């Protein structure tokens, strides 16, 4: 049971660049002090990503999903709660829901009729309260029910002083749905255009849904009135690429280099090394892609007498 | 709810005629029809039965020789034979199965004493 | 009490393992008369969305539950597809289901007058009218109640006794698959030649206690030559090194 | 197929007396079993339903009972309008089989 | 030349071929991996399946270990499913090893009894006793011929 909140003060989303974020562990193999060349879905280095700020001003639009999505949130008050995945979201095709409780994280694979503006915040103006849990009209056909340990969070809501950065990467492949998660503390630097450095992403959950996914929407936390602290979350998309990964002595990824960004990166990728010497190196040849397609066929319109052969007296 | 006879005449071996038995308002397709055989000097023999689902069960003595069907609106059951060997000089009693589990419905129907012989009428 | 014939109880089992040896244990030695897959390979050949039913019928219909044959229970109450994958399981239930005073809780549909497509349930509790006469009433002539009861007196012989059948079936439509049953956990062997098998790894070697330190999630271990050399024991979570002999 | 047999073929001696007509089956069958009464030259009629019921209109003295491949019935009063043949028939076990025939006649 | 002969259910005719798993190909009759011969199978529903049901054809279902190639086992003893002793009983975890089919005409095409005759022979090693109808001819020496 929801209502048309509306009153949306929409502004154009911001555009920032992701320096090196978005690298996770490809497979479940232990390797020590090796450079491994891999081919998978990754966030390209120095790519344009979308910044959404919530303060008043609300930002929670439905966004396209394809080839996985990288989601990031910088926060201190733990306002972001859940995610919604699906293709129709009209109680016609089954949908997926990720939501964190106080002491639970729960996974809903079922047929939902979602509200226009999913939200639980807007209570007592500034005060928070995840009321109106009935963001869906009814659970008609449920298939997958799951409960496990939730994520780290801090009590109450603190305005400003964002000290927690949470990175998640969501990838659907071969029916399986994989979520990899990472948390980093204390971000004293002002929350703009993401921090600088490198940090790997350990695998968190793999789960067998096997359903369609085309677009997703985030979930952020007397149905009107919200005056609370700021919040910033970033979204980026992935394309199939090749990377070179350096495993450390303990098996943790320490430095990743791209293969299809720069000629210097390309030759680093080719030589399976992080440094190059003075010389000439052949990387790969070039060739012009086709412009269009043409076909030439005769002009025949009369039908063949297959009937006479197959329907002879 | 009575049954109407339809049949007669003399035929030669190797020939088959159009057996029909009509109803007086009882559904013939959405019901359980059945015909039996009665001989001069010998006892009854079950011939065939058709269910409301279209399942035809008939005796193995006439395997792949009888075709039976219920009319859509004429309320008359139809059957045709194949390759008479001249042992079915008989009377064919048409009816529906007497009781599914427990019922008072017990109506029967008259049958025509058909005969099959090489010699025609004299 | 199992479900009666008119409403065959549905139960979609999923997200578990395969175990059917206890089925051999339930009743004295019998035959499954299994159609889809040979009985010896039901423990293996694991699929997704195992599809189970439960209802009680007479002895005669046990051999008549086969796809392709019609009747009354097989036609008007429960029908199987011609490409039906999976098979039935039947056992005698004289001691549980049959009652000396006469148990009439089990009922079946004898009048439906419509062919049933495979795998659907019809509940026509309303009375039917036949003879081109509008009945629309209760307890009238040519107004037959389509639901009638079995009789399960214990004095009867084989053929009329209650049999509890659990018709399992399997479907495979893409999917990652979720139902499969492992087995045959064996003792670990140290400092001896072994044809080991850990988590679907096939190889030969000698297993010894190791020293490397894994990660909570990483399982395997690979060397420079891109071959498995360290494997984590699935049951007790230590690390064993593999060496050539 | 079930071999349908009855030993007392012709009970023509009984005129309003005890009648011990009965039938047997090869395999064991339950009460799914009935009889027909047929006057010579016209369609048969029913008297008993499911080996435990009775026809809507018949004398009340008709009482039959049988289980375990043995079915028994008696007609102690021989009214003159029951001079015909009696037939045994088991059903619900395909193929549906009929008895050879029983004769009763009044002197 | 040799000639093995038996009757099996239709769905199991696939297990006869070299190197397959299952009840028939591992507990009853196992062909060597390196087979050299033929296999034959023709439906015999009328000849070999009695209308009431024929129980003359039996198959072993439970057995402790597999069968080495071309090895026959006629033993019939109770097989222990668990740790419990079976001094010979029909009770818990002690079951008869072999069971019999009940072939009937009304069954599906896969459940009707096929017939199997496996010809097994070896070539090019020793004197041959049985072979082709080809008529002999004369013999020539010192002349380039096609022998
Ligand atoms: C918002 O209004 C539209 C049009 O009147 C309606 O279809 C929709 O259900 C409304 N949403 C809610 C949450 O009431
Ligand atoms: C990336 O974002 C910057 C900053 O808004 C913009 O100038 C640039 O055109 C963007 N590039 C693409 C490819 O969107
Ligand atoms: C967590 O889940 C358990 C089990 O469903 C439930 O009893 C408990 O109330 C839940 N607690 C929260 C905070 O969601
Ligand atoms: C929020 O406001 C509603 C009504 O305005 C009231 O019922 C509720 O108690 C308030 N919540 C808190 C925490 O005061
Ligand atoms: C979902 O994926 C299946 C997999 O083949 C496909 O057949 C179906 O069309 C997809 N549906 C949508 C709405 O994308
Ligand atoms: C032969 O005629 C029938 C009846 O008109 C038709 O259904 C069929 O398609 C014809 N054959 C071909 C090959 O079109």
Author numbering:
A (entry chain B): 14 to 68, 77 to 242, 251 to 342
B (entry chain H): 2 to 123
C (entry chain C): 341 to 585
D (entry chain D): 1 to 107
E (entry chain A): 392 to 538
Q: What text appears in the publication on this structure?
A:
Similar to previous studies, 3D classification revealed that the complex adopts two distinct conformational states, corresponding to one up RBD and two down RBDs (state 1) and two up RBDs and one down RBD (state 2). We obtained asymmetric reconstructions at 3.4 Å and 3.6 Å resolution of the Omicron–9A8 complex in states 1 and 2, respectively.
